[PDB]
Design an enzyme around this catalytic site. Structure first.
Site, PDB file in Angstrom:
ATOM      1  N   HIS C  41       0.814  -1.208   0.000  1.00 51.41           N
ATOM      2  CA  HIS C  41       0.000   0.000   0.000  1.00 51.41           C
ATOM      3  C   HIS C  41       0.857   1.272   0.000  1.00 51.41           C
ATOM      4  O   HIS C  41       0.320   2.381  -0.140  1.00 51.41           O
ATOM      5  CB  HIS C  41      -1.153  -0.038   1.058  1.00 51.41           C
ATOM      6  CG  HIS C  41      -0.740   0.187   2.487  1.00 51.41           C
ATOM      7  ND1 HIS C  41      -1.051  -0.705   3.497  1.00 51.41           N
ATOM      8  CD2 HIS C  41      -0.129   1.233   3.097  1.00 51.41           C
ATOM      9  CE1 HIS C  41      -0.620  -0.239   4.654  1.00 51.41           C
ATOM     10  NE2 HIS C  41      -0.062   0.939   4.441  1.00 51.41           N
ATOM     11  N   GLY C 143       2.600   6.316  10.054  1.00 47.53           N
ATOM     12  CA  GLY C 143       3.987   6.073   9.597  1.00 47.53           C
ATOM     13  C   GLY C 143       4.642   4.843  10.230  1.00 47.53           C
ATOM     14  O   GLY C 143       5.786   4.558   9.982  1.00 47.53           O
ATOM     15  N   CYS C 145       3.564   1.636   9.716  1.00 48.71           N
ATOM     16  CA  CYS C 145       3.424   0.447   8.966  1.00 48.71           C
ATOM     17  C   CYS C 145       4.713   0.080   8.249  1.00 48.71           C
ATOM     18  O   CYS C 145       5.569   0.946   8.022  1.00 48.71           O
ATOM     19  CB  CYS C 145       2.058   0.314   8.246  1.00 48.71           C
ATOM     20  SG  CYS C 145       1.692   1.470   6.908  1.00 48.71           S
TER      21      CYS C 145
END
EC number: 3.4.19.12
Lengths: 306, 4, 306, 4
Positions: C41, C143, C145
């Site tokens: 993603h 932030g 991930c």
């Protein structure tokens, strides 16, 4: 149409079967590349199966204490090591018939195909499920140990089972292909017994989907159930509890038939409370638990007889 | 047990 | 003595953390040998998180659409592929800090250590358990991930978790290190929710053994229970059913304390029926379910305070 | 959902 316990075709496994002899004991091994794999109890004085010490027993053996026979050819053993409850014999010839293969550890409720052998020659193939209590209901006579279970994904043979022993109830026990027993069982001649078993609920439900896919709806009802209320019934009939993950797994079969999983569980619940009497489901007088969802998808049409 |  | 949620030392994981940027999105990746691993993603228009098509979105990217930053050094991306819900970016420099490592898929009830990062710089380490409903109770800001979970066996870092998202309840979801989600969750901005959770019974029992090993016996009783009657109580208090395999696992802790597992289950059963009121067990006002048996063995003395 |  039809639904049968269906085994994988055994060709690729057959080409790997050999006979291993140590002393006066003979059983089967599995020759892949340059290694033959067998039950370590091949080394055992059948009098000290009672209390074997394998490390101690193995150190007393050389390489040439073992004979590996592949057809009418003798394989020379040039190394050996114990891996848990198996032996790894290094032979001087890599097996030319070696399929692409994985070693896999199978999980309770799963099925696999069993190629029963005697003297390294295969005699028959059948299907069975790893029971919840880590036994299989096999059919095995003496000299069958080292016989293997397997599944086939594409052209890749995933080995999951190598046969070690029979229990007082006439059910069977063995190891993965790294020599780790299924269940709390040991490779000694001692008092051990299969634990209490439960019915595999995932499999029963899947096989109820199979019935609908083939064209039978007689057992359905206008009812639904919560997950949790199904389980109070499951427990009372000695079925495994249903989980949400089991619900997820039945996704495609339920999409394909249009019956929601909890709708099917409701119909299961009623089958267990009212019986079936007189009626059969896919031939069966009883509720069958040795077909997974994967096995149902594998064998039925991806089109429902509506 | 019965070792097969 | 003492018993604390204890995380693995994070050094070997820290040396693998990098920053990955695509467009206007920045998150963390895991540089092992010549590959950085991150959430796919990273490529996403935060407006078409709503309904992303990743194959379609990825084909529109080249190698130089991604920047990999390791400290103050830029890594050149020289290849890329999608593996499920991750990206595999091939960089021109193998990571010199690369530990010996396995990728592992962890099973519900197990624990791991989480190294929370922002901008490829590690900020904190904590412990948590894979819940039965496939979420973790983490602590993650935006932030985070690409932040990873891991266990360490010897000098070998087994990676089990890479962080993708937060749910409406404030619990967390992600994938293994092959990009396969834990739980029924997807990497789209859509309505998804944590399933109902249960208490991890294996872990509770283990932590009751920990209490005894450290010197507390107050909660014990002159009673035993069958496996099955424990479970009617477990179900009513929303504890996971106890299995024979769970009984087996508690073997050593029970050998070490001299309390039979069903004796402990009897004492558990009573704790759930009478509460604890006023009293604590290892500090805890409540029954703790985020320590496995392995974690108890790991951290307690192999000698009981008798 | 909140993608972090």
């Amino acid at each position: 149409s039809g639904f049968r316990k269906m085994a994988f075709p055994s060709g690729k496994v057959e080409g790997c079967m050999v006979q291993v002899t140590c002393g006066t004991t003979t059983l089967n091994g599995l020759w892949l590349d340059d290694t033959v794999y067998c039950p370590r109890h091949v080394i055992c004085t059948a009098e000290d199966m009672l209390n074997p010490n394998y490390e101690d027993l193995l150190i007393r053996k050389s390489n040439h204490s073992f004979l590996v026979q592949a057809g009418n050819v003798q394989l020379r053993v040039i190394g050996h090591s114990m891996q848990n409850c198996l032996l790894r014999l290094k032979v001087d010839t890599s097996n030319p018939k070696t399929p692409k293969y994985k070693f896999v550890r199978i999980q309770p409720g799963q099925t696999f195909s069993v190629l029963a052998c005697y003297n390294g020659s295969p005699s028959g193939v059948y299907q069975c499920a790893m029971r919840p209590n880590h036994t299989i209901k096999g059919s095995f006579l003496n000299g069958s140990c080292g016989s293997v279970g397997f599944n086939i994904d594409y052209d890749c043979v995933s080995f999951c089972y190598m046969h070690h022993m029979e229990l007082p109830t006439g059910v069977h026990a063995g190891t993965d292909l790294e020599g780790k027993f299924y269940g709390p069982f040991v490779d000694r001649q001692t008092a051990q017994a299969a634990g209490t078993d439960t019915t595999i609920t995932l499999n029963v439900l899947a096989w109820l989907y199979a019935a609908v896919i083939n064209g039978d709806r007689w057992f359905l009802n206008r009812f639904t159930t919560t997950l949790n209320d199904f389980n109070l019934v499951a427990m009372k009939y000695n079925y495994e509890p249903l989980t949400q993950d089991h619900v997820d797994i039945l996704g495609p079969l339920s999409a394909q038939t249009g019956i929601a999983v909890l709708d099917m569980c409701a119909a299961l619940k009623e089958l267990l409370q009212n019986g079936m009497n007189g009626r059969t489901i896919l031939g069966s007088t009883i509720l069958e638990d040795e077909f997974t969802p994967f096995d149902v998808v594998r064998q039925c049409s991806g089109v429902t007889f509506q | 047990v019965t070792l097969x």
